[PDB]
Structures are given as structure tokens and as C-alpha cells.
Amino acid sequence: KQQNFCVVELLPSDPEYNTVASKFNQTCSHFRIEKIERIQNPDLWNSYQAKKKTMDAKNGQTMNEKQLFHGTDAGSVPHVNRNGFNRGTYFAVNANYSANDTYSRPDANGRKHVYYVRVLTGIYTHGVPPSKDLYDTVTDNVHHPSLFVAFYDYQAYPEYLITFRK
Ligand SMILES: Cc1ccc2c(c1)sc1nncn12
Ligand SMILES: [Cl-]
């Protein structure tokens, strides 16, 4: 109920650091990563896994989960670490979209913040979502997606926080 959280800084030698950095670097290699943090929020995580289990029981062969990017300002980081994206919310397939200064506002020290988020994209359509008993998310392009919009609580887990600069 409280959704208390811990913030674990990944050592550069932690396998997960290389894994998160490689995905970011598909489109953001020109930026300098200062740190990557794991957000540990047992209540938020349990709530997210509850919704994943329901969606996994519903959508047959659908791979319901994707790992997507979300840019935030520095000030929102404690809010997202506690609440996730519960309010819909825009998630990018590529980091360079989230890395735009409008979505990852540089702070007073030039530092930018993008989460690498577990998102239950489930079954989606072009765009609360419409009928079909609704779609799980809407996307810009059903066959070549670059962004997803989630409207439901506990549909996203802010697993990793990337702090970086120009
Ligand atoms: C239209 C739109 C709105 C928000 C948004 C994107 C695209 S890509 C991204 N990454 N974090 C936030 N966002
Ligand atoms: Cl914090």
C-alpha cells in the first residue's frame, strides 16, 4: 500500500549495466551515461506482476511485455520510483525519442533522466482505449511501432533509471 522503494546503483561491471547501456546505445550512443539505477519497489512490482499474470491468461501467444523508454524531469524521479506511471503515458521503443529535451528535461546540472520501463503493451491498435473488452495499449503504427500509450494503473514498472548528459 505504501509502495516504499530502494534505489540500487548498478556497478559498471554488473551485467545489467552492460545490458541497459547497450539498448540505450542503439540510438543514444552520442550521450554520456553517468549512472544506471535499479528501482526496487516490492508493492508496485507485485501489482505489476498481478496485471501481467491476468494479461498472460487473456492474450494467448501474445508476448505482452516490452522494455520501453520514458523521459522525465529530475523532480519527478521520486514520484515515479514510488508510484510508477499511475495517473495516459507515452513510452518510446527507442531511447533517442525519450532523450529529447522536452521529455528528459536537463536539470540545473545538465543531467537528463530516462527510465527503461517494463510495459504491458499486450494487444494494441492505432490511436481509455477503444473496443474490439478493450485493447491493452495504443501505438502510432501497429506493424512498425515507435511509441505506445498505456492508460491503466500498474501497466508499467520503472525498473531502471538512466542518468546521462550531452
Ligand atoms: C508524443 C510523445 C509524448 C511523450 C513522449 C514521447 C512522445 S517519446 C517519450 N519518452 N518519454 C516521454 N515521451
Ligand atoms: Cl529518490
Numbering used by the authors: 1613 to 1699, 1712 to 1751, 1757 to 1761, 1768 to 1801
Publication passage describing the model:
We previously screened a compound library from the open chemical repository of the National Cancer Institute, which led to the identification of the potent and selective PARP10 inhibitor OUL35.27 From the same screening, a TBT derivative OUL40 (NSC295701) emerged, showing an IC50 = 3.2 μM against PARP10. Indeed, when assayed against a panel of two poly-ARTs, PARP2 and TNKS2, and two additional mono-ARTs, PARP14 and PARP15, IC50 values in the low micromolar range (1.2–5.3 μM) were obtained. With X-ray crystallography, we confirmed the binding of 1 into the nicotinamide binding pocket of TNKS2, PARP14, and PARP15 active sites. The inhibitor binding mode is highly similar in all three enzymes, where two hydrogen bonds are generated between N1 and N2 of the triazole ring with glycine and serine residues, respectively. In addition, π–π interactions are present between the inhibitor core and tyrosine residues. Compound 1 showed IC50 of 1.2 μM against PARP14. PARP14 mediates gene transcription through its MARylation activity, and it has been implied as a possible therapeutic target, for example, in lymphoma, myeloma, hepatocellular carcinoma, and in prostate cancer. At the moment, the most advanced inhibitor for PARP14 is RBN-012759, disclosed by Ribon Therapeutics, with an IC50 of 3 nM.
The human diphtheria toxin-like ARTD family contains PARP and tankyrase (TNKS) enzymes that can catalyze both mono-ADP-ribosylation (MAR, mono-ARTs) as well as generate elongated and branched chains of poly-ADP-ribose (PAR, poly-ARTs). The PARPs and TNKSs form a family of structurally and functionally diverse enzymes, which are involved in the regulation of various key biological and pathological processes such as DNA repair, cell differentiation, gene transcription, and signal transduction pathways. PARPs and TNKSs use nicotinamide adenine dinucleotide, NAD+, to transfer an ADP-ribose (ADPr) unit onto target proteins or nucleic acids with the release of nicotinamide. Here, we report our contribution in identifying a set of compounds based on a new nicotinamide mimicking chemotype,triazolo[3,4-b]benzothiazole (TBT), able to inhibit different PARP family enzymes with submicromolar activity depending on the substitution pattern around the central core. The binding mode of the TBT scaffold was studied through the synthesis of analogues and their complex crystal structures with PARP2, TNKS2, PARP14, and PARP15.
